[PDB]
Amino acid sequence: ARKVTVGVIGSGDFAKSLTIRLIRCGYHVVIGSRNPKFASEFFPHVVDVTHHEDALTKTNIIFVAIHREHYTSLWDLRHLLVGKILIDVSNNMRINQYPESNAEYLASLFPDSLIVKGFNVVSAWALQLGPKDASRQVYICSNNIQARQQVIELARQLNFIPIDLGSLSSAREIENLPLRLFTLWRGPVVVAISLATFFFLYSFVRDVIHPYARNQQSDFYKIPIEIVNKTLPIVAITLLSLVYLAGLLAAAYQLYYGTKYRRFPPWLETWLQCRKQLGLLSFFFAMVHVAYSLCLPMRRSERYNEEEVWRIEMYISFGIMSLGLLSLLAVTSIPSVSNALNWREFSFIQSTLGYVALLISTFHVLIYGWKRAFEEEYYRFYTPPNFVLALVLPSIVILGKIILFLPCISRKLKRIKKGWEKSQ
Template sequence: MPDEMARPLIRGRGGGGGGSRHLEASVSEPGAPVIGILGTGDFSRSLARRLVASGYQVVVGSRAPKRSGALFPEEAEVTSQMEAANQADLVFVAVFPEHHSTLVELKPALAGKTLVDVSNGLQIKLDGPSHAEQLADLFPESFVVKGFNTISAWTLQMGPRDGSRQVFLCSDSHKAKSSVMQLCRRMGFVPVDMGLLSSSLEIENLPLYLFPSWRIPILCTLLLFIFFYLYNFTRDILQPYIKSGKSVFYKMPIETVNVTLPSVALVMLALVYLPGLFAAFLQLWWGTKYNRFPNWLDRWLTGRKQFGLCSFLCAVLHAIYSLCLPLRKSAHFKLLNAAFKQVKAGTGGRVG
């Protein structure tokens, strides 16, 4: 259906009114722009609640207003798409990108107005045009702003303190982008100017990247594990075999891994605190805390949480492996004891 939101809701509670008790509706302020929303999906409902709670007058355009009215706050007016387009000063286009063409009949009503495209793609696109650029081609007399596609419906319902605060925005119209930035701040979010509408493809690809900030911490964890494992393998297994012919290769899957994990956990934990020391040293050296850190240090500081979680994972695995060792020795003892009893019983029978 064209009225469905272009992004799925991360649900915290069932039903359309799950986050209503977390948002207290406030009376719309005089002079505040009327915000229109085209679409009645999960994201649209959460957006309407956040806008109403921020003091905006909200009008929702639906293909079936009577059926959709109960899903929205009482303060929001649910009407036809044409009526919503006529009333609104700024319009959120919250329909699937493939249904943007169904809105062409609204072109006269949307002329000269700001359109905020919140849609996302299903896969990463390396070449344009983006959905926002296609929307701009459909509505050449409107001012298209790409934004809010990285904000989940859950974040809109629960508030920015429980989710990402940054809203990435881009547009060819500075005035339209400024108006959306003001709206973002009033909703409690932090707008990030990404430049012209040509940056919209990059913004649309952002939600599709799988753990982008985890790449370096995971790579460091793997490299450290390989280094310490090879060191322990050489010292505890390979060296005794070469010197005295003692074969202890059975230690490789459990004992060697168990000795390696705490070393990796400690080094990763050190990498959590080390950038803070570098930052403090630079601030003391500069004599001010207002200088910008180098890019490498800034990325390191923002990735400390990932480094810490990787360290914690290694520590947990070390605990699991430590529990496996006595279980393995116990099973080995029971096997030898059973074999000894069988041999003893067989020997006693032949003597008798």
């Protein structure tokens, strides 16, 4: 029933938190540091703190809890670290800082050891605490199977969820993972902000400034949130149109080149990768628009034609249908739901029901426009009304999709999708 000894190199924040987590989870830790005299009182009395040359002798699994630039300080400990699993927990301060990942550099430093990458994601504060809602998954990568399984078992005993990802070819991925902060959302968010700013300025120029000399009824105790009420929906529908224009453009490139075995242009690849983020931003903005259209027009201050009844009911119904379809798409976007669906079912949901949602949203805007545009006042300052642009982009998307259904084009796109593209 003797506890298994685990070695740790260095005495820092991560070393102390790791030692706490190991001791609480039924382990015995041997820590090697340059000056055990200095670091001995830091650690509890059940921690055996000695020199570098001593800790390695009495352990098999060693956490290299030092920074990358100090790895060469372990050069003298080359023949002691023979056949001993070295768990590399290091992290970089910048994505792609070095030509090779930290684990591969360590492996090149110590050819005879068994280098296992892992435990870098935890923050030396989740190690001190118990289970945490973000830092409960640890990714482990080693080119040696046995050492990888030993480290996975160690992670299991430390109340973690081990995740196996390969043979140090994945070390770069799990070193870049702790450093990323919504990398795929930056582009969609910038696009949404740009669209919102442009439509805000368009409404300000057309709706307010052009009749401002006529009326001039607003001051700083007024705000253009009638304009944000006209800006959120257009941004949402434009984001949906951008979600599906990427697929249209991919089809166009495939038809033009004649093969699917040609890499898309880098901008098209980035556009295709962030379609989920664009769609979720569109759903969020559509929901905010629904909230505004419910709360504001019906407020207590708002209390201060049969064909019109027709129109109002009909485009409200179309908006509700589109919102329901978008809600289905967003629900399927949860990782568990997406993984629980076949690729055929997921493709049906996303592609088909999103195209249907875009078409229904186009009708929902189109009715409003149909009896808000024929009056020459709203065709103001030579500038089309707000709904005209929010129609012109989904119109392009929908006409493209319909073009893709033509028999000649459908046949030339099936002959590509199904492999016979251009034999050579």
